[PDB]
Design a protein around this ligand. Structure first.
Ligand SMILES: Cc1cc2nc3c(=O)[nH]c(=O)nc-3n(C[C@H](O)[C@H](O)[C@H](O)COP(=O)(O)O)c2cc1C
Length: 148
């Protein structure tokens, strides 16, 4: 009955597997889940019709914090997605060898807050292998549902 959208930007598959794991948790709890690669979406009205939106994005950049490339157009047009009043939470893969660990998650959360979204949980930051972190991912999904 409640509808969740998960949109992920992933280049090596880490954030995509994380998104799949979240989608299964939410669907087992009774949500209808639509999980979309950011490469396939357009920003205008993207969040319309959804009760919960989860945004996943890995972090990149040779010497600066950059978002995963398929997520950049969505971030640049986040003001047109329908985020005002929307229950959101963010997740992403990264590598703690880097100073700005999952820094894309911070950038997306900051812009969502300016846009009036309701961030329902602190962002999930996956370091290294996501299958190794599966219990952390499922637990975070449970906590997001519990904060609605
Ligand atoms: C050039 C480069 C820069 C990166 N910069 C960061 C970074 O600043 N912070 C971070 O947490 N991870 C950084 N990473 C690591 C990745 O985000 C990590 O490999 C991640 O697992 C990719 O997730 P994805 O498969 O979902 O795209 C960097 C990786 C590369 C190759």
């Amino acid at each position: 009955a409640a509808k969740a959208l998960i949109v992920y930007g992933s280049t090596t598959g880490c954030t995509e597997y994380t998104a799949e794991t979240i989608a299964r948790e939410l669907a087992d709890a009774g949500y209808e889940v639509d999980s979309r690669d950011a490469a396939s979406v357009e920003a205008g009205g993207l969040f319309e019709g959804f009760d919960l939106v989860l945004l996943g994005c890995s972090t990149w950049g040779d010497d600066s914090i950059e978002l995963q490339d398929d997520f950049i157009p969505l971030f640049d047009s986040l003001e047109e997605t329908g985020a005002q009043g929307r229950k959101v939470a963010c997740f992403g893969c990264g590598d703690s060898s880097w100073e700005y660990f999952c820094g894309a998650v911070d950038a997306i959360e900051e812009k969502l807050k300016n846009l009036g979204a309701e961030i329902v949980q602190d962002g999930l930051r996956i370091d290294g292998d996501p299958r190794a972190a599966r219990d952390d991912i499922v637990g975070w999904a449970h906590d997001v549902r519990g904060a609605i």
